[PDB]
Design a protein around this nucleic acid. Structure first.
Ligand code: NA
Length: 211
DNA sequence: GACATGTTGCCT
DNA sequence: GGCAATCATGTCA
């Protein structure tokens, strides 16, 4: 572990699909103002191909003030507000307009602070409820629009770390993305990836699992 | 401007 | 499953 050991920019410079899959198993680290560090192992991701992808904010190569991050160098964060109250953390991948979306993390360190963050934002929250969602994880790790357009490879507040080796590569399920019905043909492209059997994924795809 | 629309969690 | 919530943001003009 350690900031010094964060994945560099040669890691993020890959096409959306390979990048999205390569993210699985890595560890997202967040350093809080009090110095505490929050860690979550990435278990769910989504690829957004860009220009072509009709689900991507960059369909038609349309670059707007909001999505600049997607057109910035790989590793560039793109955090946007959805439903006027939630955040979505994306990492720009190779290809102007392409990026990866984080949908779920396996809480590894700072669970209480995450619980605190998620609860304040009754009924007590269980760990399964901390980062099991694109917007849940953003609240749990105190990620917001202020992180938009920063560099995941060079930032003192957030970085990615190599996950542990693992004596059997994790089985990955490729499924349709969540909440992209408005994308016609692209709505069903298997551009969503997660760790098979993981109890931290936000949405399972029984069908996709038996494919 | 005027108008349309993109996750979480309560509801029965 | 159905749906309210809450509003930033993009398009049209
Ligand atoms: Na990109």
């Amino acid at each position: 572990k350690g900031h010094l050991t964060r994945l560099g920019l040669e890691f993020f410079d890959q096409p959306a699909v390979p990048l999205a899959r390569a993210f699985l198993g890595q560890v997202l680290v967040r350093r809080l103002p009090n110095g505490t560090e929050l860690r979550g192992r990435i278990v769910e991701t989504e690829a957004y191909l860009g220009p072509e992808d009709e689900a991507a904010h960059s369909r038609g190569g349309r670059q707007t003030p909001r999505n600049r991050g997607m057109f910035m160098k790989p590793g560039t964060l793109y955090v946007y507000i959805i439903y006027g109250m939630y955040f979505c953390m994306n990492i720009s991948s190779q290809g102007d307009g392409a990026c990866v979306l984080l949908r779920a993390l396996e809480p590894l360190e700072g669970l209480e602070t995450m619980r605190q963050l998620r609860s304040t934002l009754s009924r007590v929250l269980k760990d399964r409820e901390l980062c099991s969602g694109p917007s849940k994880l953003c609240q749990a790790l105190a990620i917001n629009k202020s992180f938009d357009q920063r560099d995941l490879a060079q930032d003192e507040a957030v970085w990615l770390e190599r996950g542990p080796l693992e004596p059997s590569e994790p089985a990955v399920v490729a499924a349709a993305r969540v909440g992209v019905g408005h994308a016609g043909e692209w709505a069903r492209k298997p551009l969503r990836f997660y760790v098979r059997g993981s109890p931290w994924v936000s949405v399972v795809d029984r069908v996709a699992e038996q494919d």
